[PDB]
Write a protein that binds this ligand. Structure first.
Ligand SMILES: [Zn+2]
Ligand SMILES: [Zn+2]
Lengths: 203, 46, 232, 155, 263, 114
């Protein structure tokens, strides 16, 4: 699998649709809407060894497992708050209580002195557009301060032709007059790079 | 560096400690001040 | 999650009788199981205030990582070819999935019929990147390895979600593993509760089990302070 | 075996069963017969539309925590409890420019009805085609087989 | 051209006199409100004081520094620190100003808005320049020092609106009138003998037809045609007080349409 | 001391939607939209535009108390017409009116030499 995240900094709630139509003649079908939470935590340790970030990102995918990936210093930790995702063996030997919660809840309620939530960007009612061997997800990101931008999630099973697929979408962005945007297809396990890409495109 | 106390009139710095004599060096006057914290204070401009 | 529980114990010699009793009482023979737990604490080299962004007091606590291991990793050569059943206990790139837990000291109250402990848990599924080892990840959170222990035992599934564990615990260090439970088994009966009703109902289930074993083996509420993982 | 397993592993508590889910002794069994009928008609259709039309052709059917001791016992009866499926591969003569390949798979997802899956590819990388199809009606498989043999298989 | 129309009467760096016809009073007003309150500006918001030997209080001075107008032309390419991703402030969200002053002179040493220096990187955008309208080119008089009177401080200017603080108010008084002959009967003139003799005639009377007594009351008549004057403080140019005002109100309405859309 | 933060006037609260549309019980085809972190600036503007809509039977807004930046707007339309749609159209009309106003000001300003 492969992926890329495009974040349109300069944009408005409408930009989503404008790009949605530039694909009207490339679309095939539309699957269920998706959601996503993007959190930023700042470390409160004051002796922090030089060149160790003080920043940690938390990317929560909704029904991509209700999973949350933690990213810090180019490293990622995949977690889940879904009892249904618990490895059977951990439930059997008692390692798990069978009733997990979010790593973010733990961070804010048990480790809040060490980690403070700085920002919380949410993307609701996203759209899953299905093209030719390229799935394109679109969602408007909002902060506690109103609109924050447009986010494009590009997932493609086709390991081959991809660099072309990404360039194509960036083109339709030029058409809708969407200039000054950031694109990431970097890498560090799918869910991890995807999470990483959001970070690169938003940080 | 360091000015523990200042003089009230002549404004000459003093820097004295406990049981040193509460007076200024040249002028008599036992008045003496404290000199601002080096822990810089920030204010909202509203 | 709220874990309601009661504890007890028996010496090695009480094993067979207890297994026989629990097998008749529950209807099922025991099930062998193990788990490795690694406990971590805030890095002492780093120091942070103990307060919120809202300037509210936060108490430093330990984080517990737990998983299983294939039984074959616990059976040496002398242990070789011995029924892999309840009787065995007598003769005693990326990271793996782990259970991450932080617990609170049990609920206060004189004359508590059971111990009641709140447990915050999340699941670690995998990792990637430079420092992907669970150890590095814990360090990234600002924690360091403190200690770890292995627990081997048999469990029984009973009605209403009641579970009974007969366990042996070994602390693990290069200097050697020492059996914390040397002499016998730690007995634990508990139910995990995700409404007041279900809480009073769960207490009843535990109380009936205590009642049903009265005379034979006693189950009681351990000291709150003995179930407090806060760092100090 | 299933109820017990359902009790051993998950519940910490009691079983949960459904007649519909848990329904099948006899209903799952009857399907065995209806499938045999269905497979018969399918082979007839194939003979008519394909085998008789293209001379060399023929057809070959093919088979498509530690409780493990329990899962092994139940796995043994997967033979009886599986949704019935056979794959009928049609052998076609190799054209020296390209080798066409055709196969059909018959299955009964709800045990009493039939689905027919047809795959056809005769690649010449200039002419290369691929079909992946699903039909619930023998009438349409005749029409699609006809279409296929006509254009692609025939001389 | 289309819908509501403008007809500018006078222009300068500081004033826009115009006539707004084919508009709802509600719209004229809503624009008037926005210009006063919701247009963003840059203004000093944090003042770290290193030294102050002055006759004035740390916060007394601090307060004044907020009221000093700063160049907010390119205010739109600066982020609100609240929305910004740093820890406190940065370049993407603030302008750092510095002020060091000392009484070298035997005579009284003055401290002006000109004595402010930008220390942050401007990203080459028209921002944070103390607005100097002053003939002698000094700008706002912040303080007066004597001899050993030193004032050493640091200012963090941030994007904001007049709703949070009146320092982020880009507009001075906005003049607003309609129907200079009370044709609409929107006021009952208080008088002693004659309301016509007693009450002064508006300037705008010249831009409208007098009612002519030998006519019945026009009830059907509605309020369109508004004589306004927009005065700028400096932060934004007079025209842009009007334009940005029109745009803010437009954006404000769009948010509602969008809110309904998400619902 | 008992003074609320100034941003509370415009910055939405934790889990607080701009709009909350509740239906009016007392009247058919009538609704009540509560606008959080908003004032007269928007209320009176919208109310006045809905008044221009012929298919709109009732429209009024009220700031129930000045300590709080929020207003309730009540919309009643003719049967078949939706009040949310009525609000949508009035919102649009306003924008299009402002769009022309800007264009017209810009043109007129450019003509001035001062
Ligand atoms: Zn002296
Ligand atoms: Zn910043």
């Amino acid at each position: 699998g492969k992926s890329a995240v495009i974040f349109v900094e300069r944009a408005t709630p409408a930009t989503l649709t404008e790009l949605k139509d530039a694909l009207s003649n490339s679309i095939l079908s539309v699957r269920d809407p998706w959601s996503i939470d993007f959190r930023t935590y700042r470390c409160s340790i004051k002796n922090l060894p030089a060149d160790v970030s003080k920043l940690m990102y938390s990317i929560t995918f909704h029904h991509h497992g209700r999973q949350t990936v933690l990213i810090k210093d180019n490293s990622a930790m995949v977690t889940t708050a879904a009892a249904a995702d618990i490895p059977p063996a951990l439930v059997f030997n008692g390692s798990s209580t069978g009733v997990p919660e979010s790593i973010d809840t733990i961070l804010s309620s048990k480790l809040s002195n060490i980690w403070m939530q700085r920002q919380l960007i949410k993307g609701d009612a996203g759209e899953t557009l299905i093209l030719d061997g390229l799935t394109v997800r679109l969602v408007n990101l909002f902060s506690s301060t109103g609109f924050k931008g447009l986010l494009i999630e590009l997932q493609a099973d086709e390991a081959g032709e991809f660099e072309t697929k990404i360039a194509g979408i960036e083109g339709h962005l030029a058409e809708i007059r969407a200039k000054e945007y950031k694109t990431s297809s970097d890498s560090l396990n799918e869910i991890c790079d995807l999470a990483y890409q959001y970070v690169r495109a938003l940080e | 560096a360091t000015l523990k106390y200042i003089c009230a009139e002549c404004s000459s710095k003093l820097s004295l400690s406990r049981t040193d004599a509460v007076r200024c060096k040249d002028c008599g006057h036992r008045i003496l001040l404290k000199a601002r914290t080096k822990r810089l204070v920030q204010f909202e401009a509203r | 999650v709220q874990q309601l529980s009661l504890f007890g114990s028996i010496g090695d010699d009480g094993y067979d009788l207890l297994i026989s009793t629990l097998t008749t009482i529950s209807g099922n023979p025991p099930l062998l199981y193990n788990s490795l737990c690694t406990v971590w604490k805030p890095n002492p080299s780093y120091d942070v205030e103990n307060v919120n962004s809202r300037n509210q007091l936060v108490e430093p606590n330990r984080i517990k990582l737990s998983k299983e291991v294939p039984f074959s990793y616990l059976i040496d050569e002398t242990m070789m070819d011995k029924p892999l059943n309840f009787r065995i206990l007598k003769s005693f790139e990326s990271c793996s999935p782990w259970s991450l837990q932080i617990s609170d000291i049990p609920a206060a109250g004189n004359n508590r019929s059971v111990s009641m402990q709140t447990i915050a848990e999340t699941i670690i599924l995998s990792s990637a990147g430079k420092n992907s080892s669970v150890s590095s990840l814990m360090n990234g959170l600002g924690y360091v390895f403190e200690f770890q222990y292995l627990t081997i035992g048999v469990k029984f599934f009973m009605k209403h979600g009641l579970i009974l564990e007969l366990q042996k615990i070994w602390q693990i260090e290069e200097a050697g593993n020492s059996q914390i439970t040397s002499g016998g088994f730690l007995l634990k009966a508990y139910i995990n509760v995700s409404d007041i009703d279900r809480i009073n109902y769960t207490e009843t289930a535990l109380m009936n089990l205590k009642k049903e074993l009265q005379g034979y083996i006693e189950l009681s509420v351990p000291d709150r302070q003995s179930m407090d993982s806060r760092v100090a | 075996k299933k109820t017990l397993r359902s009790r051993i592993s998950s519940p910490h508590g009691l079983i949960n069963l459904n007649v519909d889910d848990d329904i099948l002794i006899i209903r799952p069994i009857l399907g065995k017969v209806r499938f045999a009928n269905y497979k018969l008609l399918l082979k007839k259709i194939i003979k008519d539309y394909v085998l008789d039309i293209v001379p060399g052709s023929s057809i070959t059917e093919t088979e498509v925590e530690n409780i493990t001791k329990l899962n092994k016992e139940i796995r043994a009866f997967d033979k009886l409890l599986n949704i019935p499926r056979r794959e009928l591969k049609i052998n076609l003569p190799l054209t020296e420019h390209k080798s066409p390949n055709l196969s059909l798979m018959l299955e009964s997802p709800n045990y009493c009805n039939a689905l027919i899956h047809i795959k056809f590819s005769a690649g010449t990388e200039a002419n290369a085609v691929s079909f992946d199809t699903t039909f619930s009606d023998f009438k349409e498989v005749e029409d699609f087989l006809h279409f296929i043999v006509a254009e692609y298989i025939q001389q | 051209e289309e819908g509501p129309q403008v007809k500018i009467r006078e222009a300068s760096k500081d004033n826009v006199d115009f006539i707004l016809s084919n508009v709802d009073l509600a719209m004229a007003n809503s624009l008037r409100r926005v210009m006063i309150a919701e247009i963003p500006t840059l203004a000093i918001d944090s003042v770290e004081v290193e030294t102050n030997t002055t006759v004035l209080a740390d916060e007394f001075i601090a307060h004044r520094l907020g009221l000093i107008p700063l160049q907010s032309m390119d205010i739109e390419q600066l982020e609100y620190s609240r929305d910004c991703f740093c820890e406190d402030h940065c370049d993407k969200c603030s302008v750092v100003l510095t002020l060091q002053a000392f009484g070298e002179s035997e005579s009284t040493t003055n401290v002006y808005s000109k004595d402010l220096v930008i220390v942050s990187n401007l990203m080459g955008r028209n921002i944070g320049h103390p607005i100097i309208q002053d003939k002698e080119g000094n700008g706002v008089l912040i303080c007066k020092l004597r001899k050993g009177q030193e004032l050493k401080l640091t200012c963090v200017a941030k994007k904001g609106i007049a709703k949070e603080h009146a320092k982020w108010g880009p507009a001075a008084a906005i003049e607003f009138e309609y129907d200079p002959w009370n044709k609409l009967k929107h006021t009952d003139y208080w008088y002693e003998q004659d309301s016509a003799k007693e009450w002064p005639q508006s300037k705008n009377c010249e831009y409208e037809d007098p009612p002519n007594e030998g006519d019945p009351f026009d009830y059907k008549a509605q309020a369109d045609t508004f004589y306004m004057n927009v005065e700028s403080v400096g932060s934004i140019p007079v025209d842009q007080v009007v334009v940005r005002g029109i745009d803010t109100l437009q954006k404000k309405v769009a948010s509602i349409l969008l809110a309904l859309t998400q619902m | 001391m008992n003074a609320p933060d100034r941003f509370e006037l415009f910055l939405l609260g934790e889990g607080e939607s701009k709009l909350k549309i509740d239906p009016d019980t007392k009247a058919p085809n009538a609704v009540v939209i509560t606008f959080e972190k908003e004032d007269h600036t928007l209320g009176n503007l919208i109310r006045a535009e809905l008044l221009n809509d012929r298919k709109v039977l009732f429209a009024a807004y009220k700031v129930e108390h000045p300590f709080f930046a929020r207003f309730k707007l009540r919309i009643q339309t003719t049967e078949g017409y939706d009040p949310k749609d009525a609000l949508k159209n009035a919102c649009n009309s306003i924008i299009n009116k402002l769009g022309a106003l800007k264009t017209n000001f810009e043109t007129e300003w450019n003509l001035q030499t001062l």
